[PDB]
Design a protein around this ligand. Sequence first.
Ligand code: NA
Lengths: 138, 195
Amino acid sequence: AAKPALDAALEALNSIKDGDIKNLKALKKPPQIITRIFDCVLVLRMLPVTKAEYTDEKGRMVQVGNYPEAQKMMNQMSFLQDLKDFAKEQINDETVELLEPYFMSEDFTFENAQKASGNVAGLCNWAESMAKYHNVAK
Amino acid sequence: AKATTIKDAIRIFEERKSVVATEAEKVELHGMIPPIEKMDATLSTLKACKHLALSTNNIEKISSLSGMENLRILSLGRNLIKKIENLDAVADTLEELWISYNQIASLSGIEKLVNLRVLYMSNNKITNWGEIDKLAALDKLEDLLLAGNPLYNDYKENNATSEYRIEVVKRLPNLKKLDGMPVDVDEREQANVAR
Ligand code: NA
């Protein structure tokens, strides 16, 4: 049991409105960091991410996000509730290890992601809280 | 800025964790920038390692595990691996293979991991039940993850995941957990009648 991690995960999802997802769809190109935020969601949901591969973003090498798969996820009207329904007790140790490279980047922070894209940056806190939950609960 | 060698990855690990890699039980070589592309004989110095983390790299072939006398968890997820092979050196001790997000279509060679208890291979390229039959040789296999393989997606997209779980347990009667969910007694019974 890890209620502080679960509390932070729920605050993260409750900070995101349906209009935020709509407006993100309206962007022709997303800020690069938001594609990595969504990659963390894809990994937790065992959805496709591309090979390890890096691009220069403001002077640091960071993972190229699999944004088309993120768009497919966002095009499901149930997306936010699907994250609320996420079965945290089924996260395994490999999934946490696959998240860690994203959290390794000096720029992968809520403050930086929020400056780029607003409320949807809460998904960074959601992903980190799920990993924290798993590591505590065992 | 093309590829990171095992030697260079170990130096990065030792700077981040302040442990000599030859002493360390968990050697974290995951997510190197640039990616690791080749496993090599430097891995033989990792004599204490029980958990080798090589995930999130660009490794194409499994090789060079000789000398890892204590290896229990081999983590190779999110690489470019196509074939299960070159694992005889750790078969006596390996209990978990984590290899999701690779390019594995054939499970030929998995039979050597006689002590395997956990196999995570989400988002690979398994398309047919004949590959899952190859897992029946593993007498200790308890936990299996196939989510995201074409074979799994076939059933998921037709709202038939329950039929897929029965097909798995039909071939693996003693499996305890599948895609993160326990195999329940009713699934076993349906699998017994199907078998
Ligand atoms: Na938005």
